Design a protein around this ligand. Sequence first.
Ligand SMILES: [Mg+2]
Ligand SMILES: [Mg+2]
Ligand SMILES: [Mg+2]
Ligand SMILES: [Mg+2]
Ligand SMILES: [Mg+2]
Ligand SMILES: [Mg+2]
Ligand SMILES: [Mg+2]
Ligand SMILES: [Mg+2]
Ligand SMILES: [Mg+2]
Ligand SMILES: [Mg+2]
Ligand SMILES: [Mg+2]
Ligand SMILES: [Mg+2]
Ligand SMILES: [Mg+2]
Ligand SMILES: [Mg+2]
Ligand SMILES: [Mg+2]
Ligand SMILES: [Mg+2]
Ligand SMILES: [Mg+2]
Ligand SMILES: [Mg+2]
Ligand SMILES: [Mg+2]
Ligand SMILES: [Mg+2]
Ligand SMILES: [Mg+2]
Ligand SMILES: [Mg+2]
Ligand SMILES: [Mg+2]
Ligand SMILES: [Mg+2]
Ligand SMILES: [Mg+2]
Lengths: 172, 257, 146
Amino acid sequence: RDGRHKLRLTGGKKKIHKKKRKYELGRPPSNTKLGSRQVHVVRGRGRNYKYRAIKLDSGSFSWPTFGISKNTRIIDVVYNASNNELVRTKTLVKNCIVVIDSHPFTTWYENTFGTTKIGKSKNIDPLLLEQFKQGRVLACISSRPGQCGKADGYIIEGDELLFYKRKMDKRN
Amino acid sequence: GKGIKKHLKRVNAPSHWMLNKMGGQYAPKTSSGPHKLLESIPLVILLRNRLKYALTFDEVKMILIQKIVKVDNKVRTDCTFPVGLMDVIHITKSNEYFRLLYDIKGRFVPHRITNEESKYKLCKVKKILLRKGRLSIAVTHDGRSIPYIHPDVKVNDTVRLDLETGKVLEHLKFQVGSLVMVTAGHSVGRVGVISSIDKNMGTYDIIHVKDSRNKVFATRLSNVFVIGDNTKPYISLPREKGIKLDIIEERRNRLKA
Amino acid sequence: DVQHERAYQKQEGASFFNSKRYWKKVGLGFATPKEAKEGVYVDKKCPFTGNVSIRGRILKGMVISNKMKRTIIIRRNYLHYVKKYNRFEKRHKNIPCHCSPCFDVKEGDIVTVGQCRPLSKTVRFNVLHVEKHQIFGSARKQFVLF
RNA sequence: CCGCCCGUCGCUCCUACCGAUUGAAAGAUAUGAUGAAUUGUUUGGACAAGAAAAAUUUUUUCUGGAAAAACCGUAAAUCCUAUCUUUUAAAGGAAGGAGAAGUCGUAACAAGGUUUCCGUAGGUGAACCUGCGGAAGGAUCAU
RNA sequence: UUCAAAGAAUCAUUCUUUUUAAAAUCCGGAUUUGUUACUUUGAGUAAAUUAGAGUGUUCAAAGCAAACAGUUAAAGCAUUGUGUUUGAAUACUAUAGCAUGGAAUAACAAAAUUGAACAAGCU
RNA sequence: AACCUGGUUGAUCUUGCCAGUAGUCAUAUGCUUGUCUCAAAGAUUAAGCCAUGCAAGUGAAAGUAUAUAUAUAUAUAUGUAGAAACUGCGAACGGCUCAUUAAAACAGUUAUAGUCUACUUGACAUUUAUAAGGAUAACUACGGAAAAGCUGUAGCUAAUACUUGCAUUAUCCUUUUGGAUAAGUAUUUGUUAGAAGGAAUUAUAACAAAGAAGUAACACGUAAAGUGUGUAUCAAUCGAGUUUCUGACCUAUCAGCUUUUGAUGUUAGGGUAUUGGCCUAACAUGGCUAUGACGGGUAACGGGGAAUUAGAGUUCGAUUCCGGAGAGGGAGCCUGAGAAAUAGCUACCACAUCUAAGGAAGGCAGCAGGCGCGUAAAUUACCCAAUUCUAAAGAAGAGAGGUAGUGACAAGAAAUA
Ligand SMILES: [Mg+2]
Ligand SMILES: [Mg+2]
Ligand SMILES: [Mg+2]
Ligand SMILES: [Mg+2]
Ligand SMILES: [Mg+2]
Ligand SMILES: [Mg+2]
Ligand SMILES: [Mg+2]
Ligand SMILES: [Mg+2]
Ligand SMILES: [Mg+2]
Ligand SMILES: [Mg+2]
Ligand SMILES: [Mg+2]
Ligand SMILES: [Mg+2]
Ligand SMILES: [Mg+2]
Ligand SMILES: [Mg+2]
Ligand SMILES: [Mg+2]
Ligand SMILES: [Mg+2]
Ligand SMILES: [Mg+2]
Ligand SMILES: [Mg+2]
Ligand SMILES: [Mg+2]
Ligand SMILES: [Mg+2]
Ligand SMILES: [Mg+2]
Ligand SMILES: [Mg+2]
Ligand SMILES: [Mg+2]
Ligand SMILES: [Mg+2]
Ligand SMILES: [Mg+2]
């Protein structure tokens, strides 16, 4: 299923002469969603287990500027450069932009210096700040939850963030 | 079903085993181990076809059962254990010590050797890994990992390695004039000095090796085993001393006897 | 316009926030062009800018097409000896290569391509160095022994 | 030269062709329909181990979990077409080859008794004849 | 499009040494200079078969063995004990790929409604 | 041994075929055959069908024995065997055939900086304990079914089955001693820092987060304190998957193909052990082709090779080795390091066996053997002795393999004076 059964670039039918060799395995997609955590183990090749997350929430999210990370419930999926169907179904994949319950980062900031190891000097964006004010912040996912079994991700920043906002843009 | 192959057919056996076409259908199939089957040799062959201590596989097995044959000083009861290029065999009852070497043909001889020199073995490093705690480990052609190797050891050079204890004695860099043995194509037994190394960019680094008849021959760097500094070898070489004669010369030599 | 896709075209291996844009050397004496080091453009499968290491064969060709996006075709023209007639005969083979927009390549231009991993159904190569060259018929028809 | 021989027309044998017959047959793909089994997920919840109360029984919560079901996804198989390939029948038709001292002529070989032959068109029992333009492989290397 | 020239050996010929321009490199001396085809050396390849070396399988087809000394020891070599010499070569493994010496023969690239080389000056 | 003779004619010289002529690890068949050596042999037709038997098991210190037997030493102590079964490992090798398959496979040549890898080897570890928890087999008793390698119930009991779960090292001060700070292997994410390799987003180091699995609740009694079994990561190895380049027969009375059905590419993903239209979505309109694409044919598995050649070549290559594929036909899974396995399973189709008619099992292209087909091909033999494999690894198994039997396939030597 990872295999041939496909035209030959010249557009000639490869007359098949070989079954399907198990090492051409194409086991089917875990459309991993939001919800309470729930993950199965699929047994890949040499007992190499991999963790089909099927529901998720509490991924590890990073804040790249400051280069730190925190575990947060993720409250909604809002964009998917693959397809809008996935976002409709609220399915987490390796480049989904999603919304983090983003109090943790704020709390961390407060603990460290001010209110909304240390190479601080950068001191936050405007857009990001605004986002924080509502509690909830946009962030890519970066793990492939379907393989790794974790919704690990990172906060979307400056230029990329702007681009994603534009993409989202509402309007009509 | 289809997985790995357990058997070896006696014609498909690598020539320098020197098996028969008759005298069997199969060959021994070296166990996985510290050597590459095409450049190893199982213990069975050693016991039966080289030393001729055994007539049969059965006899070899029996011998092994008495825990009396050591290869690199720790015992082996696996009949088809691969012995390979440099390894000292200590048959305990005779108090014989062999070291495997190459002939001037491709063939393994067991060399015969002293107690004193037996205690070490040469080992060429292949890879030099960094591992946890920034500690470097060399990996020898003996499929053996030497940890905490002396920093000046580089990827191709040989290492005089003790057997009683896992630690190393000394190392011999892969220099422009370093006494070398070969271990692959055509010039296999050959022993030379090295003239020159090519150091090709994407490819195999070919090297040229002047003999003691001053006959230059080239070889891949892959399959060259450093054995000395220009003066003296750090091991006892066989009687021929790696001097692959011409065919005519060889014939003449044969005649004069 | 750099960001043309539905996704943000980033450049993996960049490192934006901390540290003292990303390109690499690719080796075998193929000089990374100015357009890779300068000149923003994101390419996952650029030899220099992206994450594909060229390794294996290097073979010169001559471009037939630019029609695909960031992807080129190169016919290798060569001579298959036939022992019966102790003569040769022109033969050929169209290698598809990935380009990367550091190289502006019109047709008939000589290129050299390194191997690299399977980038798509057929493109296993990418162009490392583009000699200029000029052509008058169709590149299709130019034999250049090489 | 009482030589050679040409074609129709009969007669016998064999070969392949055309052939109505939606001819037939098997196989191959391609479409579509239904669709066994089943990976995965979802629903399930026979029960087997806990937690709650009464003196072994009652009600409620947490675990693992069989059957059964639903949805994608692999997808056998069967049926229906379509197309193609392959053998294969057929009244009749029309060739060919073989044979037999058969019928009718005399076409060709000699200036073969209209030189021959070409291409083309029409003709005619049959060889063939005729027209037009070619050729000499002419019966003229020549005024 | 660098043709040639001169010296020594051998039985008119063969094999060898030396220099005749220009540019870069090295402490007046000394040493790098288009691409590919082609060719030469290699490298790297399973053996069996094939060619082929050795070996009286009684011959031979074979095989990959064997030979040697002795009514039972000498001789060797080992510090009473231990047989000894060995052999199972080599070449073939494309037409492609790898490195490689190359002077010929081929291509191609370089090259004027203008092309690049230096010395000075300015940025 | 670089070879030619007869045939057109009344004769001649050519062209030209026919005929002879030799060989074939090339089949058949006819007649004939006293030795010996060697030895192909149901490929060609039907990858047609199969009665019976056999072809993968495994225990010699070393998981589990109140089935049980037994010998010592003083009713206990050790022991020594041990049917059975659980566990473990193997059964993915081997063997067979050649139907498929014509840039596919295969050969050489790369590549894996794109991966997986049991056994074997070597390195070698991290966030009640004088010893933990049940619950299961064989077994006992009660059963059922015509039958099946069918299993029901109740009661036990082990395990190396299954499940828990107990200091020291590196960074800073003092004179080897006494304090301070840390302390997760893969794996994953984000942030950086960077002894090789031609080239690194490599090794590695740090920071912020998660995080499997593990580090002996095991068994012998060994060696000159050892071993077996198990175990995280790394490397080696036995490999495997993909992959680069180049290389194939006949056909143009196959010339345009491929693209809604992924054709060509880009992006993002999903999936994979990893790369990849491998799959999904979105977007391009590509890609191949007279140097033969795409079809068709092959009485095609590929190659190493075989025959025959002076030299070229031509034909063959089912068939000793390597590779591919397949186990009646497709398809689908489980186990496992490795299978899309077929003497594993599920299903359908096509064959087909037993049945008390309810059901049940079955797959010789393993070895023999039989029918069929055919021009066309051997014994239902003996053995593990050799060669090897597997195992709890001398000690057991092996139709793998070998030895004979049949054998005018071939090949060699050689009577009949
Ligand atoms: Mg199979
Ligand atoms: Mg007249
Ligand atoms: Mg007439
Ligand atoms: Mg006339
Ligand atoms: Mg008229
Ligand atoms: Mg008329
Ligand atoms: Mg003839
Ligand atoms: Mg006799
Ligand atoms: Mg058959
Ligand atoms: Mg057979
Ligand atoms: Mg044992
Ligand atoms: Mg038992
Ligand atoms: Mg097999
Ligand atoms: Mg366990
Ligand atoms: Mg699509
Ligand atoms: Mg076939
Ligand atoms: Mg074959
Ligand atoms: Mg056949
Ligand atoms: Mg069958
Ligand atoms: Mg199957
Ligand atoms: Mg069977
Ligand atoms: Mg079946
Ligand atoms: Mg049979
Ligand atoms: Mg026969
Ligand atoms: Mg045996």
